[PDB]
Each structure stands twice: as structure tokens, then as C-alpha cells.
Point group: none
Chain length 468, copies 2
């Protein structure tokens, strides 16, 4: 049986001065079955008219039952549970065992998520808080750089790190992954070099788990050694150390060490995750060695490497009505006092009388110093059956106000929301901004279309997402 899943997004913006442009994106996935051999392919088409195809993953896998493993051939990706997740081109013999992004938009913004240089998700978003959920990242092991391009007041860029749960294994169970080939990047700044990566996980009695890994290259050597216990009550803890001997593009030899801590809490929904990784001055990843020293946003420099990485992802259930999420990350670098901070907090209350939702977004990157603090508040009051909406946005030194209605038609599937209000605040002048959207969701055969207008900018977007 063959399966396919696509995600289309096309917007045509029209404004004065001559900034009118048309952009279209298509995130398609294709799966083919020709007798045990499972072919999987993921390609992204990007178009910007101020037109290139981008291949991410194309592999052909075979499941081996007698050995409890699966052998994949071609363009695939490695699991980033022990080391940093990397894309490859070759073969992988791994045992066949076994992210949500939050943010607030100013107005009509273009959601663009990129992982490993590859463009994975593209969509258009109305002002306020948004949740994605539907995206399946190709090469889901590394960090995800998500940027929302606004019209005119163009941007806020922030990267979301790979969330990892403490490495736990059942007693007697062994999970291994051996791969050999060359390093794939997709991003036009890296080299492709041959490597050999082999990881191992073993379950120990009394909830303990021993795990290690080795990734050898022509220019890079690493070793891992770690333990992880399962308590259940109070959650789980996992500690691992990594030794790395890396030679940079300038042939400079470096000795590096990195300690890693992972914490979890037992599972309404009460997910808790605290992760801390501290790296030395001479510590570099496998991706760091493959580079051209300097290029150039998305600016990299090997002189300022990663130091301390704090992560926090907590969820609290304050009754059936109230749901609170709090996700945060912090990154420090050697040399400069610049840091990378990403913080998302959403507080929600939903029941058959009124709908309250408070949202907070704190984004701070290096080289910019400036931090974007966003406060969002949406109030929905249900009453043929309509629902009155009240949305307010506060970003930095600018404000946005709106108050109107929005409900669903055709029993359940069809939905419409025609917003109106004023937008202005800090830059430019105080004008009036309003939009109208139409979305139809069948058996995962979605089709959305919207029209937006301000005092100078006009938007017209369309999107189709279908999965078989």
C-alpha cells in the first residue's frame, strides 16, 4: 500500500512602494511499498517572486525480523538521542524499537521552520497565538530554527532545541544503531565527509540503563558513556559524559568534554522536562568540523562555540478547564556574553461559558542584543451559533487591538472568522487592520483561504493539506 501527505501554502501580498510579491511552498511526503522494501521520500518546493526544489530525505528500508532490526539504504538520518542528530547518505543497521512549536504573531505572518538547513514547514498565520502540531520533521533529531516573517515589520527569529527524554530501557532489551556513510547537510556551507557511527543502549536491573556510542571520522572522534535510572515516582534521571577530539576547518586540533543532565516527571497532562548540558571551550560537534569557517542571518563562527545549554518544558493541569504550558531554553557561548534565549508560556481556560487564553513569548538571540517580549490575550464568548472574540497584542513598544466574532458552519467541518480592529503602535502610524478567513477540514483534506488588509498592506493567502 502507498501513502502520501502534502502541505501547500501560497500567499500573494499587494501593497504600495513596490513591495508586492508572491510566494508559494509545498511540503510533500511520499511512501511506497513494493514488498517489504519500504520507500520513503520527502521533498520541499520553495518559490519566491521578488523557484528551487530541495531534497531532504529519500531512503529505501527493509525490516529484518530474525535479528529485530531494520536496514535502510540511501538518504536518511541518524537518531539524536546520544549524539547530535545528523543527516547521512549510505546505510544504517538499527534495531526496530518504538515537536510542538508555540509563538505569537504581530499580524499576518509567514511561518517558516527550518531544520538542518532544510525547509520543513511553511504556512500563513493570523495575529495572536498559534499551534502547529501537524508537522512531521524530516531528520527529526537536531535543532529547529523557526522564523515568522511579518509584512513590512519583518522579523523575529528564534531556534527551538531538540527535546530529549531520559534514556530508559527494559531489562534484557538491547537497542543499537550502526551507520556508515557520508554526512549530508543540504545547507550550502558544509562539506560532506565520510563517517562511521555506532550507538548502543542496554537495560539494567532495578530501572537502570547503560548507554554509549562511538562516531569516528577522518577529522573527528567522539565517545560517549552514560547511565540512566527509572524511579517512576519523582520521574527519571539520566547523566552522560562525552569526550570529543575535533579538528576544525583550519586544521586546529581541539580537546573537548561535555557533561549532560536529563530530568523527567511521571505523567490530566503533566509533562515535565529539565535538561542541562555543559560543554568545554574546546568542545565541538561533528557538524562543527564540516564547515567553511565563515559565511555571511544564520551566521556561524567556530570561535564562539556552545557552552551551557539549559532547557525546561513543563505542563500543569489545573483542573479540566485550565491548561498551562511553559517551555523555555537558554544557551551561552564561549568568548562573547551573548546568549540565545527562547521562552514560550501559554495559560488556557476552556469551558461552555467563556474561553480565556493568555500567551507570552520571549525571544532573544545573539548578535542582536534586543529581545522581543510579546503578551497576547484572547477572550471567546459563545452565544447560527456564533462566538464573540476579543484579541489584544502587546509587543515591546507597540500595541494591537481587535474585537469581533468568529464561528463554524456546515455543522462541524467548515469554519469562518472575520476580524476587525486597529494596528499601529511603535513604528509607522496608527492605522486600521482587519482580516477574513475560511477553513474547511474533512477527513484530513484541509483547505484554507484568507484575505487581510491594513492601511497600506493587503494579503491574500491559500493553503491545502491532505494525507492518504
Amino acid at each position: 500500500a502507498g501513502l502520501l501527505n502534502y502541505n501547500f501554502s501560497g500567499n500573494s501580498v499587494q501593497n504600495r512602494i513596490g513591495g508586492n510579491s508572491h510566494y508559494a511552498y509545498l511540503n510533500l511526503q511520499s511512501g511506497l511499498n513494493i514488498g517489504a522494501w519500504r520507500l520513503r521520500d520527502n521533498t520541499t518546493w520553495s518559490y519566491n517572486s521578488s523557484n528551487k526544489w530541495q531534497h531532504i530525505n529519500t531512503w529505501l528500508e527493509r525490516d529484518i525480523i530474525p535479528l529485530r532490526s531494520r536496514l535502510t539504504l540511501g538518504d536518511g538520518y541518524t537518531q539524536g538521542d546520544i549524539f547530535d542528530g545528523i543527516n547521512f547518505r549510505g546505510a544504517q543497521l538499527a534495531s526496530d524499537d518504538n515537536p510542538v512549536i508555540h509563538g505569537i504573531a504581530r499580524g499576518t505572518a509567514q511561518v517558516t521552520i527550518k531544520q538542518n538547513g532544510y525547509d520543513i514547514y511553511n504556512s500563513t498565520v493570523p495575529p495572536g497565538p498559534f499551534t502547529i502540531n501537524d508537522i512531521y520533521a524530516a531528520g527529526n533529531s537536531g535543532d529547529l530554527q523557526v522564523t515568522i516573517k511579518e509584512a513590512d515589520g519583518s522579523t523575529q527569529i528564534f531556534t527551538v532545541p531538540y527535546s530529549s527524554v531520559p534514556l530508559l530501557q527494559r531489562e534484557g532489551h538491547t537497542r543499537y544503531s550502526i551507520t556508515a556513510g557520508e554526512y549530508r547537510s543540504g545547507n550550502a556551507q558544509q562539506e560532506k565527509p565520510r563517517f562511521f557511527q555506532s550507538t548502543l543502549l542496554h537495560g539494567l536491573p532495578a530501572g537502570w540503563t547503560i548507554y554509549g556510542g562511538t562516531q569516528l571520522a577522518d577529522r573527528y572522534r567522539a565517545f560517549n558513556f552514560g547511565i540512566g535510572k527509572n524511579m517512576g515516582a519523582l520521574g527519571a534521571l539520566s547523566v552522560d559524559m562525552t569526550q570529543a577530539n575535533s579538528t576544525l576547518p583550519d586544521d586546529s586540533q581541539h580537546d573537548g568534554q561535555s557533561v549532560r543532565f536529563l530530568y523527567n516527571k511521571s505523567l490530566g497532562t503533566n509533562i515535565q522536562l529539565v535538561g542541562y548540558r555543559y560543554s568545554t571551550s574546546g568542545y565541538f560537534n561533528f557538524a562543527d568540523t564540516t564547515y567553511s569557517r565563515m559565511n555571511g542571518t544564520d551566521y556561524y563562527n567556530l570561535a564562539y562555540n556552545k557552552r551551557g545549554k539549559l532547557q525546561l518544558t513543563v505542563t500543569q493541569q489545573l483542573g479540566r478547564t485550565s491548561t498551562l504550558y511553559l517551555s523555555g531554553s537558554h544557551q551561552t557561548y564561549w568568548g562573547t556574553s551573548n546568549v540565545d534565549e527562547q521562552f514560550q508560556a501559554g495559560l488556557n481556560t476552556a469551558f461552555e461559558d467563556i474561553n480565556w487564553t493568555l500567551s507570552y513569548s520571549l525571544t532573544k538571540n545573539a548578535w542582536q542584543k534586543g529581545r522581543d517580549q510579546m503578551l497576547a490575550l484572547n477572550v471567546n464568548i459563545p452565544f447560527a451559533s456564533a462566538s464573540y472574540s476579543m484579541s489584544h497584542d502587546l509587543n515591546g513598544r507597540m500595541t494591537n487591538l481587535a474585537g469581533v466574532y468568529g464561528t463554524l458552519l456546515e455543522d462541524n467541518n467548515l469554519s469562518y472568522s472575520v476580524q476587525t480592529g486597529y494596528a499601529g503602535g511603535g513604528d509607522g502610524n496608527s492605522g486600521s487592520t482587519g482580516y477574513a478567513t475560511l477553513n474547511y477540514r474533512g477527513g484530513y483534506g484541509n483547505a484554507n483561504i484568507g484575505y487581510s488588509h491594513s492601511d497600506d498592506i493587503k494579503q491574500l493567502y491559500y493553503g491545502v493539506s491532505g494525507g492518504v
Copy 2:
């Protein structure tokens, strides 16, 4: 209650002393009474563009016993020459043949719209699985060789006599703008309404009218079903046309049609006067390069022939030809396709002939092909020869199937030369499969100069 869809993928990568990708999809959506039908063609060249052909939503009105399509559709080419349109229509409730020298990609396109793209192995090739979008006008098929050689031959749609019962009354009234497809054509509005009647003793009569800003036409005809002799249909057309400029013209066109009785017979002859012009011709603007056309030298006499004869259990013979004459010019447009085939488990003989000639071209393209297969764990030693106007080809090894039933393959190698230039060594190995309609074929070809690798995925989903 289902959305059925039918796809046709074709990818080809070349490496010589570029990569191509083509997709042909037929989308269908059925909820309640409305039927959303879509036809889109995707193309990719690496020396990317989207092209839609038909996108409409149709409702079956049962009390009046008529369909109601809205959007982008096509008119039925039974009385007038069928055209693609954007608007509304209230209507009541072909295999191609060719010969290729080497591994070449074949592009079939009608009325400007690209409908089918696939690469085929050397020798006589048959598609059979083509789904022509806007199936009414003439079909144009181009075969781009490894050498940059194109064999263009226009074999039109097979025209059948109009048949109706006794109590049946077929009608179709359409109104909207003419969809061009290709460039160099304008966008005018039209109104077209046809009617057909069926009477006793095999007779039927039909009429039709076309009205536009710069085009007027009216037509009527008679048809007869004779059984043993087959079917005969004669109709007359008068059309007032004003051209791209401002000159006004008027003509009468007569169309004769014949069918008899596998033994499928088809003869269609259409003779037109000097002042007669089609609705598609008026949309143009004079004359243009790139598909050459000249309205000063309009179509005169069209002779279409499609015959098939069964000589026995072993032998099959088919002939498909079309001949066109023009006013004020002695030059003739000729297309011809002949094919003999004999197979009876012991030996396989197949002959193929192709004759192509255009109005703006001086030299003809006479092609002759011959394939001899000798069957024998099971194997079949195959041969092939390609011979044309001052050029020759030689290749043969074997071609058989593994796993049985569906998975079949063919590996051939030989020396190709010909004439204009020099001779070289060629060879190709291809795999093919059809288990469960949703199939994929893998092909590899090598030569002394050009190396090719291609794959095609054709399938059809339902539910």
C-alpha cells in the same frame, strides 16, 4: 462517496559528453450530487511550471435529465470541432502509435495542453493507457530523440458517425469564454447549442449553432445505421468568419463519415471551401512561428482513415492515416501508421511503418521497423531493426519475465550507426511491472556518447 485519482509519473536523467520530471494526474471528488473533476500537468526541466487543463464541478439534475458543469471544461466534438471553455454547459444525461530509433521521451499534446509524457525503449511503442484531457481536437505527438531530433506528426481524433435510438433526444447548450491552452490565441466569448434526434429504421438527424462576436456558424446533418454495412453520416456546415485583422469571410464545410463492424473501420472525409474557417482559427492573430500556422492558406480536404483487419488467430493488421490539403498551395500534409503483428508461442514477428509530412516541411520521414522474437527458465531471444531516410540501427539480445505474471524485463545491445555522421555502440536494460495497476518501471541506457537513466510510475487510486 469517494475521490478517485489517477496519476502518471515520468522521470528521466541524462548524462552525456540534465534531469527531467513529468506528472499527469486526474483528480476526482464526489460528495452528494456535485462532482469535482480536475486535470493538472506538472513539468520539470534542468537545463518548473504548473499547467491545468480542466477544472470543473458538475451536478446531475435528474428531473430534467441533464448535467450542469461549472468552471473549466470541454465541449463534445461530435458536430463541431470540440473546444476547451471557461463557463457553463447544460448537456443531457484513442490509441497512438509510433517508432523510435533510440531511448527517447515522448510528448503528446492537444489544443496546446500537455496531456501525456513518457520515455520509451527503441522500436515500435504503444501507450494504450492515455487519458486525453479535452478529448475532441487533433492530437499532436512529438518524439525527442537522444540526438536532438524531433519527429512531429499530427494524428487527429478518430471521428465516429452520430448514432441515436428512437426515443432519445441529446442536447448540449454551452456559454462562456474560449480557453486557448497555447499562446498566440485570444479570449472571446461564445454560445454553442447542439441538438440530435434519433428516428426509426436507424436514422438520426442532428443540428447545431455557434454564435460569437467575430464568428457565426450553423450546421445540420443526417446519419444512418445499416447494420451489416455499418454506419454512414453526412453533414453540412456554413460559417461566417472575420479574421484577426478585419477582413470578412464565409464558407460551407461538408463532412462524410463511415464505420463498419476485432474489425474496426473508420473513414472520415471533410471537404471545406476557401471562405470556411473554424472557431479555433478566428482566435489566432495572423501567422506565427515557434507550431506554424497560416490563415491565408486554410484547410481544404481532410481524409482520415483508421482500419483494423484480423487475418486469423495469429496475425493482426492495423492502418491509421490522415491526409490534409490546403487552399492556394500544392503542398500536402501526410500522416501514416502501419503495423503487422504475428504471435503464436513459437515465434513473434512484428512489422511497423511510419510516414510523416508537414505543410511547412519539405522532407518526409519514412520509417520501417522489424522485431523478431524467438521464445524458448522461460526466455525469448529478441531482435530489432530500425531503418529510415538515410539512417540505420541494429540491436538484439533477449527479453523475458521473472516471478511470473507481472514482472517483466528486456536487455538489448547492438550497434547503431545510421548516416548523417558516424556509427556507435548502444545498449539498454529495463525492468517493468504491473502488479495491481499501481506500477513502476526502471530503465537504464548506455551509448558511446550519451548515458541515460529513467523511471516511470503509473497508477490509479480509488476510495
